[PDB]
Symmetry: C4
Subunit: 388 residues, 4 copies
């Protein structure tokens, strides 16, 4: 095989279609299944694989107690064929409490981060081996995407952040070839605070719709020039707004340039993508907590500022159900590259107090140009049924 | 590899021989096994795989309660090598409460249907990716075969129905190439109500022996012309009759043209196939409920109307045991293409009331030209032993 | 690949060396493992696989009760890489209560037998498909080897028996090519009663050391001429004697020609092989029940009648432990074809009455030309620990 | 493929980076996982596999009681892809209570030892078959490395010992090609007692840093000349000292030539490797028991005697946690061959008395030339949570 170049236009879509569902939680009630969080998906040239950072235990395990915590030395990245649940035979590809993964065309690149919060180490494992590594630069939680990185012509991009979870941080874009760090670009542009990036190829460059955790409800954009390693950044134009927390659609706005300063602190891993002057996005239905999920196109949402005109809406998860993080993944077709997405459905502790654990399920949809319907596909577990 | 064309005569058979049995239920009593219904089998050029629509839980799981229901957002299609049981490592290839699957020669085509009964969406996933999709046309339960579709020269056929489960519906035949819908043919002919088709290659065309759920006990035939996408339909000639419910062999009949109007409402997924003027079929032994299974040739059962003369009978499942749906699958040999079949053995709720669940087992036989014997191969689980 | 021809001399051995052990039973006490009996092993050109006829349930399952019975419609053949235990992911390759399996060089040939004792059917599945089948000829338990068959130049041999378990039976040798029965040879020679054959290549022919269940304690030999399909038969010469039951070494004998008529009724699947005028064999240490296992060469045990002079003895299983059936399997090396063997270690019911089940473990040794030691490798399960 | 020759310089490192962690024990509390000890890792040209000698039972099994014992007839070697835990589907490649394994470039070589302590047999299984075997030479526990052997130009080295665990023994280096023993070299040099060797390629020869169990706290070196099969031996120069037990850094020393005679009896499988005049090693932090693990370079630790000057220290396992054996494994990169290591973390009996079993977990780090941080990665199981 040769290197992936993602040289084909984007497919023109009408909406999305059901792709996969793992049903992890319902299964946990009667089977040895892993405790997870922060899942995502990628596809090499032939098939897709689902990932997630495990918690070092099975759900029906006394060790699952107090799993709300994001960072312990036992979290490792697990990889399986999309659709087969995280059973004991699953593979732990590395030690990591934060990750990103991508296939350049020749093989897989895994970026796993771990260690002490003030002095973490991030490993780059290419083609099954450790090729390079980097240590924390701001000594305050070195972190990254929690979803696929992308490669073009054998160079894969990854954006990491170190520093304040609610103040000026130090965001950088890394270029690695064959597992080795070839260049490092420091963030530039108007974007005030970048987190958990949401990247997708847009030849000849890569685009990320990230999370602003300090002063923004609107989402930051980070354009990466694969050529001279240049970087531009801003906020989406769409007057709707896809972060949580946020103001209601009537009291919302963005100018494409600076944080809207409305319920800016906190956030959630989100996504969006361009379609000419238009924009396709997804957000939780509630503006306060992570509940429900719906998607829609916003006419003029990319080019015009404060665009609120929406259409082609579909609810993935209904108003009454819990969701979580979200990401996008691109797949190469016969004539165009297609855009897909997954939804992490979290259940348990800190929100549902019967149990003492925290884990999650996933659902993924892919874009289509045909016709479709309506429905709702949530986790589906009866919190009252077994396990803790 | 090149595309499958199924260009070889049909093998001349004497009866059938034991092929496989999964024993799912006996195993469920002491192991983490999935809850299933509507199973089937297909074989790519080298090996056969067994499928079924799961219920999103393990049998020994509190979530298995009230599994009688045919449609929830958690049913997904599972695929395994024929003979290995549905364990936790099994793969959920898509979200679906109704499906069909086939291999064109180059890869697999999965047609999975899901969502709200009045507004369902059916996905076409070819070579591991989502390529097209279609929405409901009559807003009343869009459905399909629940067994393999077939491809000739890289074009695969699938027949779907939307509408009344006991009245005029809207049946259509879809032609898809490489995952994309290339043409749609509306039903024609004398067949009054088509359901859960039973298709098999008969170069240069495809033939389906379906289920009539409204006015017929006799079974409808749907001939598909791979050339001009033409479609003819009728009812089998055989005076015996292979549906359930039905009249006893003495008070039965068909004229090859219209529903026999005898105990027509309701039915069960069934099968049959031509052998010159003769016919090979299988039906449950009881005329009222789904119990037992036997097979036989009916001399003149294809060409002559109301043919009751039978021979070469074998009981697969004895009078005293439960069965269920049934399908056929064709396999290419060195000189002729051979016809096989599976039997879904359902156990549990709505019929056996000790337990609160519903699941099933399978047994499959393949045609032979040699000699064989007699016996009975049912599920084999002691309803009194464990699980609920 | 081309067809296997087994054209290399036999390796000259000094004794045997430890190869594999599955530890099934110890594992059953804390894991979902199958209930088995009549195991064996074969190796395709690259690796060995272990087989056994399952009982349609897990050990820690209420369905394991009364597993002593040799024939129910739920026994199917299971295949795994030698050394990985029979877990739920294991593959049931066919329905069978008696079998034999072999690889011709191009693929696998599975001969599985099942159905009613008076009217059984045996299936021939080649390269994953059903190619032929045969029905019972004496209506009294059609049976076969319970270990590998062998192929030379693409023709595989298998010996079946039908009839009296303790009287004149009808033994036949089947020749099948690519799954199809090409010729059938009826037994000839002096051998009075042939059962559970023990075959191995000895180019240009095949040799089997079977079990005499009627009038013999000495073992019958069945020579098959791959050329004209000719068949000769006799009894081993060795004055020792390798069947159970039997007379003690002082009151034993054979003349190479007829049954020794000493404790002839009953028996156990056994083995032996030529080494010039010498013979290598293995037998249980006890002359009454199946306990212990030891192997040795008998100087002149092939050519001279009533040879009792033995040497190079090794105990595999000590006097105090249970064993069971036994078989041989040949493996191709760089310059000679090597002879190996497995021992089935049965535990449970009809002999150990704490539990209500019956299952088994295996141990396998391969010939060597180097040096070795001593020891004992039995099942190893504490009948007092868990399960029933 | 052709034979591995390991012809590339050693990579120049700065320290080590996190690679893998299996979390076996936490998982055992809620899942069927094997009981292990003496683990290690090797990598064929494309991927790494983790090994360990099982105990013939699952942890949550009554059979796990009294697992402290190093040698029973039920221990067999298990192999899995590095990172997937020892579940029931795991493969037992051979019967062994002591082993070593390596890939010559063409395939795997497994050396498994078993039987009676006074008369053991060691098997050589190449490319899936038994090719040779050897019997004990001193009749007092024949043993070997418990970690990978190495091959250069298709000849693999392995060092075995037989005799006194605390007195003069008989150590030998075996050369085997394609599974066959081609030459045997008896130990020579100043090294007083060699055990559990720690070998790594250093073209054109192989080097081992072993364990001295009789009179030394410093570690012996065994240089093997792949050419004339010559052998030299000594003790490391470093005044620090990497064995346990040992004297504290202030009262320690070595002269590179003879045992330092300080707390010499007993020991633990350890490691080290040259870097010009420098040395990279790892040892438990405590000088008395196997607790904690730290690594560092000792300036001049190879060439100069009694070198105590250290730098670049990292703690893998903190002072407060249990560790165990340790080994190294080399991996080929694009321009240099890289050095890695694993740590066996043992938990349970004879030290932690709540439970009646003994098993272990693993953590592995690989060298890097980039930057890294700090942290601690121990087993992580709550001895109070479940299992015994
Ligand atoms: C999951 O989490 C909390 C805390 O459990 C931890 O306990 C420590 C010691 C350690 O083992 C760690 O691995 C565990 O995760 C548990 O909540 C406890 O609930 C009981 C309710 O009665 C409280 O009772 C009190 O417990 C003390 C001893 O701690 C008794 O002596 C007192 O009399 C009193 O009853 C207990 O303190 C709770 N602690 C907190 C912080 O809420 C929870 O039970 C645990 N287990 C489960 C099944 O979820
Ligand atoms: C499987 O199905 C039925 C219904 O269970 C559902 O319960 C709801 C609340 C939800 O959790 C859902 O996931 C469950 O599937 C169960 O049948 C019940 O049997 C008991 C027998 O005593 C009935 O008793 C009554 O129950 C009420 C509370 O519902 C009590 O307060 C009353 O005093 C009275 O005892 C119960 O109502 C039944 N309901 C029906 C509709 O039959 C069944 O038990 C369940 N579980 C199992 C193991 O099969
Ligand atoms: C395994 O086998 C035997 C027989 O069990 C079978 O029972 C039938 C009904 C069916 O379910 C089948 O699947 C089972 O395999 C069991 O042995 C029995 O042991 C009890 C000891 O008390 C006997 O007691 C008597 O049982 C009758 C009802 O059968 C009572 O009403 C009487 O009062 C009396 O107590 C029982 O008859 C035994 N039968 C025989 C033939 O020995 C065995 O328990 C079973 N189970 C287990 C765990 O091994
Ligand atoms: C794990 O190990 C020890 C020994 O168990 C072995 O028992 C033998 C018979 C065999 O089954 C083997 O497989 C087992 O491994 C167990 O320790 C025992 O603890 C009890 C505590 O009360 C002791 O009590 C005494 O036991 C005798 C019978 O042995 C009674 O009749 C006396 O009245 C008295 O209570 C017992 O002797 C202990 N033995 C030793 C050597 O410590 C341990 O319980 C076992 N099981 C578990 C769960 O760890
Ligand atoms: C992206 O990769 C494709 C796929 O490899 C490139 O296509 C080749 O490039 C041109 C287009 O016809 C010709 O020189 C070759 O015949 C093509 N063949 C194949 C197999 O790809 C494509 O050009 C690449 N795009 C870019 C911008 O480099
Ligand atoms: C990705 O690689 C393609 C494939 O070579 C690049 O396109 C070529 O650009 C070079 C110089 O950069 C020219 O010499 C060729 O004429 C162009 N096309 C081909 C098919 O060779 C492309 O510039 C690279 N793009 C990115 C984003 O790195
Ligand atoms: C169905 O496919 C077969 C198998 O590919 C076709 O066979 C080829 O067609 C003719 C028959 O000899 C020759 O031109 C080729 O030499 C055949 N070779 C191979 C490998 O198939 C067969 O013709 C096809 N049938 C139809 C009706 O198209
Ligand atoms: C299936 O494909 C075969 C293979 O080409 C078709 O048979 C050929 O038909 C074409 C035009 O349709 C002729 O030009 C060839 O001479 C015929 N045979 C071959 C081997 O090329 C066949 O018509 C197709 N059948 C179906 C049902 O689609
Ligand atoms: C058994 O098979 C082998 C292996 O295929 C045959 O060897 C060939 O036969 C002769 C011996 O040199 C030559 O004509 C070929 O060069 C050999 N090559 C290969 C790859 O095998 C062997 O002859 C066969 N034995 C018999 C009796 O037919
Ligand atoms: C197995 O096949 C070999 C390979 O051909 C046979 O040996 C040849 O015999 C034929 C006629 O039978 C001769 O024409 C050749 O000269 C012989 N050798 C070779 C290498 O071709 C052998 O007879 C067959 N043996 C068996 C037992 O079937
Ligand atoms: C070790 O193996 C390598 C890899 O196979 C050898 O490299 C070959 O040897 C020389 C170096 O260029 C040339 O003759 C070949 O062109 C090389 N090609 C390949 C694919 O390896 C290397 O020489 C070996 N080292 C030693 C000391 O033998
Ligand atoms: C490993 O193999 C290489 C590859 O051949 C050996 O290097 C060659 O040595 C031979 C004679 O030993 C010379 O004829 C060649 O000129 C040398 N190089 C090559 C690339 O062929 C090397 O000696 C062997 N090393 C070891 C440790 O066994
Ligand atoms: Ca925010
Ligand atoms: Ca009907
Ligand atoms: Ca006998
Ligand atoms: Ca020591």
């Amino acid at each position: 095989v040769e290197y992936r170049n993602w040289s084909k236009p984007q497919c023109q879509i009408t909406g999305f279609a059901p792709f996969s569902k793992d049903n992890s939680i319902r299964l946990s009630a009667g089977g040895d299944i892993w405790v997870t969080r922060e899942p995502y998906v990628s596809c090499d040239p032939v098939k897709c694989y689902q990932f997630a950072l495990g918690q070092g235990t099975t759900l029906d395990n006394k060790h699952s107690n107090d799993t709300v915590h994001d960072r312990i030395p036992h979290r490792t990245l697990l990889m399986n064929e999309l659709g087969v649940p995280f059973h004991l035979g699953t593979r732990q590809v590395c030690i990591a409490w934060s990750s990103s993964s991508c296939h350049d065309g020749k093989a897989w690149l895994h970026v796993c981060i771990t260690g002490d919060d003030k002095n973490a180490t991030a490993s780059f494992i290419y083609d099954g081996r450790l090729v390079d590594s980097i240590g924390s630069w701001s000594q305050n939680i070195l972190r990254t995407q929690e979803s696929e990185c992308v490669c073009i012509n054998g160079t894969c991009t990854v954006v990491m952040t170190d520093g304040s979870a609610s103040g000026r941080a130090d965001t950088r874009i890394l270029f690695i070839e064959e597992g080795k760090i070839v260049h490092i670009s420091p963030l530039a542009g108007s974007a005030q605070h970048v987190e958990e990036c949401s990247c997708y190829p847009r030849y000849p460059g890569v685009r990320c719709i990230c999370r602003d955790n300090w002063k923004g409800s609107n989402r930051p954009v980070v354009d990466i020039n694969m050529e001279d390693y240049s970087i531009d950044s801003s906020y989406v134009c769409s007057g709707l707004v896809g972060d949580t927390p946020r103001n209601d659609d009537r009291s919302s706005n963005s100018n494409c340039r600076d944080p809207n300063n409305e319920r800016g602190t906190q956030g959630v891993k989100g996504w969006a993508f361009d379609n000419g002057n238009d924009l396709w996005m997804g957000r939780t239905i509630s503006k306060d907590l992570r509940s429900g999920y719906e998607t829609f196109k916003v006419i003029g949402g990319w080019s015009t500022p404060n665009s609120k005109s929406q259409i082609n809406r579909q609810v993935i998860v209904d108003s009454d159900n819990r969701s979580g993080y979200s990401g996008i993944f691109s797949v190469e077709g016969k004539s165009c590259i297609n855009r897909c997405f997954y939804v992490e459905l979290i259940r348990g502790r800190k929100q549902e107090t019967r149990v003492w654990w925290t884990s999650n399920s996933i659902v993924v949809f892919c874009g289509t140009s045909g016709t479709y319907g309506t429905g709702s596909w949530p986790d589906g577990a009866n919190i009252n049924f077994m396990p803790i």
